[PDB]
Design a protein around this ligand. Structure first.
Ligand SMILES: [Zn+2]
Ligand SMILES: [Zn+2]
Length: 72
């Protein structure tokens, strides 16, 4: 998967707004929180337009592996 170069708990309020583009706050394009973790993403980047409705649940790439019996 992708890798990280930097990051820290400081900047955007609770609502986690992150995307490949590089947005940290509501720019203007509709977004949706990942039912899995709870991160707002660009409904467009993910591949969705206002035209169609929103998916009951949307999981991110990080969740794909996050989801598990892993107690720790
Ligand atoms: Zn984006
Ligand atoms: Zn997620």
């Amino acid at each position: 998967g992708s890798s990280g170069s930097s990051g820290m708990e400081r900047g955007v309020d609770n609502w986690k707004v992150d995307c490949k583009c590089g947005t940290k706050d509501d720019d203007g394009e509709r977004m949706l929180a990942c039912d899995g973790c709870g991160v707002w993403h660009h409904t467009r980047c993910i591949g969705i337009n206002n035209a169609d409705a929103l998916p009951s649940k949307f999981l991110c790439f990080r969740c794909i592996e996050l989801s598990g019996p892993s107690s720790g």
